[PDB]
Motif scaffolding. Structure first.
Motif, PDB file in Angstrom:
ATOM      1  N   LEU A   4      48.549  40.938  42.183  1.00  0.00           N
ATOM      2  CA  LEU A   4      47.486  41.021  43.182  1.00  0.00           C
ATOM      3  C   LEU A   4      47.979  40.371  44.473  1.00  0.00           C
ATOM      4  O   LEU A   4      47.944  39.144  44.613  1.00  0.00           O
ATOM      5  CB  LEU A   4      46.215  40.346  42.674  1.00  0.00           C
ATOM      6  N   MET A   8      40.904  39.828  45.660  1.00  0.00           N
ATOM      7  CA  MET A   8      39.929  40.901  45.748  1.00  0.00           C
ATOM      8  C   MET A   8      38.633  40.398  46.375  1.00  0.00           C
ATOM      9  O   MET A   8      38.358  39.195  46.423  1.00  0.00           O
ATOM     10  CB  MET A   8      39.644  41.496  44.368  1.00  0.00           C
ATOM     11  N   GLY A  13      36.535  42.216  39.635  1.00  0.00           N
ATOM     12  CA  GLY A  13      37.718  43.040  39.473  1.00  0.00           C
ATOM     13  C   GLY A  13      38.881  42.292  38.857  1.00  0.00           C
ATOM     14  O   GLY A  13      39.724  42.893  38.185  1.00  0.00           O
ATOM     15  N   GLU A  14      38.945  40.976  39.068  1.00  0.00           N
ATOM     16  CA  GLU A  14      40.001  40.186  38.447  1.00  0.00           C
ATOM     17  C   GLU A  14      39.728  39.980  36.962  1.00  0.00           C
ATOM     18  O   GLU A  14      40.651  40.043  36.141  1.00  0.00           O
ATOM     19  CB  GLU A  14      40.136  38.841  39.160  1.00  0.00           C
ATOM     20  N   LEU A  17      40.531  43.265  35.152  1.00  0.00           N
ATOM     21  CA  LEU A  17      41.968  43.484  35.018  1.00  0.00           C
ATOM     22  C   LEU A  17      42.587  42.556  33.983  1.00  0.00           C
ATOM     23  O   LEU A  17      43.533  42.947  33.291  1.00  0.00           O
ATOM     24  CB  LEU A  17      42.660  43.307  36.368  1.00  0.00           C
ATOM     25  N   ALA A 297      40.258  47.932  41.064  1.00  0.00           N
ATOM     26  CA  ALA A 297      40.724  47.441  39.773  1.00  0.00           C
ATOM     27  C   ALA A 297      40.664  48.516  38.697  1.00  0.00           C
ATOM     28  O   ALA A 297      41.525  48.550  37.812  1.00  0.00           O
ATOM     29  CB  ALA A 297      39.909  46.222  39.342  1.00  0.00           C
TER      30      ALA A 297
END
Ligand SMILES: NC(=O)c1ccc[n+]([C@@H]2O[C@H](COP(=O)([O-])OP(=O)(O)OC[C@H]3O[C@@H](n4cnc5c(N)ncnc54)[C@H](O)[C@@H]3O)[C@@H](O)[C@H]2O)c1
Ligand SMILES: NC(=O)c1ccc[n+]([C@@H]2O[C@H](COP(=O)([O-])OP(=O)(O)OC[C@H]3O[C@@H](n4cnc5c(N)ncnc54)[C@H](O)[C@@H]3O)[C@@H](O)[C@H]2O)c1
Ligand SMILES: NC(=O)c1ccc[n+]([C@@H]2O[C@H](COP(=O)([O-])OP(=O)(O)OC[C@H]3O[C@@H](n4cnc5c(N)ncnc54)[C@H](O)[C@@H]3O)[C@@H](O)[C@H]2O)c1
Ligand SMILES: NC(=O)c1ccc[n+]([C@@H]2O[C@H](COP(=O)([O-])OP(=O)(O)OC[C@H]3O[C@@H](n4cnc5c(N)ncnc54)[C@H](O)[C@@H]3O)[C@@H](O)[C@H]2O)c1
Lengths: 318, 318
Positions: A4, A8, A13-14, A17, A297
């Protein structure tokens, strides 16, 4: 196995992922930091406006997907991905609802003279009600420049809900699209300028639209008309906008985008009571940030599973 | 013969009366001017807030109809007119669209933090964008108190166009009216307070609704919720609202009506950046003035033709 480059817009989204991939985060990228962690990754997320040059793509061996943070893709070497079999995907239009609401906010604010009447009450001049009269939107004419994602959603709400006559200028859309949002697409821009009580601009920034609204345009507009610009700052030739307000070619304006950006501390537009501003926040809501984080993501997992993502920039790889 | 104690809000109502009656206009009326011109007329229009006492009614021999300029009737001696067989008519609900648009204007303004973000940019604090984030209305819950003419129009626009979940509290309305505007009528007010991200007031001012929004109401509301009041000032107990803002029981408020009115130079609400004001202009547009002028002028001609007008205040005379 995913890097990354920049954070974000939302942490969701982290977390998504991290469910399926080994995630590494670089917070403030420099020329040397990116490569020493990009050599072995299989997917990369690039935060606008961070740049990704040919030196970076060449070191990423297993790289199969590059994802920008939003619509911006100018900082990415698209050529190095098309030949290497790498798909590149952006995330556009995920703040469509945000700017649509924001545009509506500024149309209503100008019609009800909101920011001005707020200061009058706050300064004890409540009796200004005897001198100032708001405007009723129902029945007035709205001129939409650019019938894209935002222009259509704004047109749809103003024509039906607010009961306005909505004219649209956009030469690159099928002739039947304006009828789907109960608007009337016109072929001559001058017609939209003279007939509109409100002009809101939502076009793409092209060599054609660059400084499309100069002094020549403001003359055609009604003196009682208003201008709303949530698109790009360069779409309006700002000195001519300063002229239109000062010479009263228009009754006011609402501005979320500037040229240059950021606007100087002593911008001449700040002096006028009939001009209101927002600091480029039209498409900045928590929900919009989540959507961008999710779309970016999630499309990473689509390519890593073989599925065709919806926003491929180089279709010649599929 | 018809006498106009004060001008109508629009000349269209005066032209209509002149088509069928002998019309006399007093522009800045005094108590004695009323007396000397009311003795022979058969219908009279009173512009708020001029008073029409028993002495004036007692001198009007041929009087059969009295019409106020709007909803307000406190300056008229209804008892002295009810006894003499004179019908009194007000003019309510003729600015429904105006208040509906004005209410929407303030809901959007709070969500996009418009006046706060406007002042920041105008004062060189463009970088406030890094600290403040607007709110997206789509998906949030709107609580409508009073599902009448205005409450319904606000509900219909917010439910469909703005894509909000609209709750309504109104114990005196049929259960099926909320469904016509895609809202959900609830029976317990506490439900609307706890579930709403926005609460907008549109009830009639009764002893039941008088200061209905006190500290007990603000506590139940979400700290992230906002309050909008375009109805009447007494519906909100203003000290409790000042406390809720300062103690951060709610995220902000929008106020068009005050108690007491007019608000003083040092209203404690003025200090807060999350509170915005308008000087009681929600229902004051040129279109709204025309409609009220017509309705007031028309009910005069209705009584002079034997027809029962729709807004009789003393029905016991018919
Ligand atoms: N912030 C906004 O969105 C917005 C939009 C439109 C107009 N305005 C402002 O509202 C006011 C009315 O709009 P308009 O187009 O009808 O202008 P206008 O000049 O045509 O009429 C406004 C009337 O109100 C009086 N007035 C105006 N500004 C005043 C002030 N600061 N202090 C005391 N009296 C004042 C003037 O004497 C005039 O008669 C103008 O000052 C304008 O700058 C603000
Ligand atoms: N203020 C913000 O925070 C914010 C956020 C997102 C987007 N924007 C801007 O708002 C604008 C609208 O966004 P969008 O999602 O609707 O883009 P879009 O691609 O969906 O639509 C843009 C439209 O512009 C039309 N157009 C192109 N040239 C034109 C011309 N000469 N005259 C008239 N119309 C023309 C195109 O046919 C297209 O339909 C864009 O410029 C975008 O950069 C601003
Ligand atoms: N329609 C409006 O005018 C409106 C509505 C709501 C809030 N506000 C104002 O917007 C600001 C932020 O809203 P919130 O509800 O999220 O507050 P908040 O207490 O929840 O926190 C807001 C964040 O922004 C920062 N911040 C807050 N006020 C700031 C200021 N004056 N200058 C610089 N940074 C500031 C804080 O560091 C905090 O992190 C508050 O000052 C509030 O009064 C205005
Ligand atoms: N310029 C302005 O700001 C402006 C203009 C017009 C009207 N108003 C005010 O706003 C409101 C206008 O609403 P309207 O035109 O739809 O009138 P309305 O009579 O049609 O609606 C008022 C509603 O209040 C509801 N109600 C009564 N008691 C209630 C209770 N205990 N709890 C919840 N709801 C209750 C009634 O069922 C009714 O439906 C009135 O208070 C009017 O005085 C303000």
């Amino acid at each position: 196995k995913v890097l990354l480059i920049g954070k974000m817009y939302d942490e969701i989204g982290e977390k998504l992922l991290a469910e399926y991939t080994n995630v590494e985060i670089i917070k403030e990228p420099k020329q040397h930091q990116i490569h020493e962690a990009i050599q072995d990754v299989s997917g990369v997320f690039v935060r606008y406006p961070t740049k990704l040059d040919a030196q970076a793509i060449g070191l990423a061996k297993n790289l199969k997907v590059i994802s920008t943070s939003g619509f911006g893709t100018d900082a990415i070497d698209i050529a190095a991905a098309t030949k290497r079999g790498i798909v590149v995907v952006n995330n556009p239009g995920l703040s469509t609802t945000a700017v649509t609401e924001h545009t509506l906010s500024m149309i209503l604010a100008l019609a009800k003279k909101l920011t001005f009447l707020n200061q009058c009450v706050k300064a004890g001049n409540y009796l200004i009600r005897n001198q100032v009269q708001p405007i009723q939107l129902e029945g007035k004419t709205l001129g939409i420049v650019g019938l894209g994602r935002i222009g259509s959603a704004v047109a749809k709400i103003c024509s039906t809900a607010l009961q306005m006559r909505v004219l649209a200028y956009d030469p690159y859309v099928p002739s039947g699209k304006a009828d789907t949002v109960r608007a009337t697409l016109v072929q001559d821009l001058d017609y939209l300028l003279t007939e509109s009580d409100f002009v809101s601009l939502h076009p793409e920034l092209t060599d054609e639209t660059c400084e499309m609204f100069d002094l020549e345009a403001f003359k055609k507009m009604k003196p009682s008309a208003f201008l709303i610009n949530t698109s790009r700052g360069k779409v309006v030739r700002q000195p001519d906008l300063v002229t239109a307000i000062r010479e009263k070619l228009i009754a006011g304006a609402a501005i979320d985008v500037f040229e240059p950006e950021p606007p100087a501390i002593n911008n001449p537009l700040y002096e006028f009571d009939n001009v209101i501003f927002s600091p480029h926040l039209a498409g900045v809501t928590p929900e919009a940030g989540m959507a961008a984080a999710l779309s970016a993501a999630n499309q990473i997992l689509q390519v890593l599973q073989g599925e065709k993502p919806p926003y491929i920039i180089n279709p010649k790889v599929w």
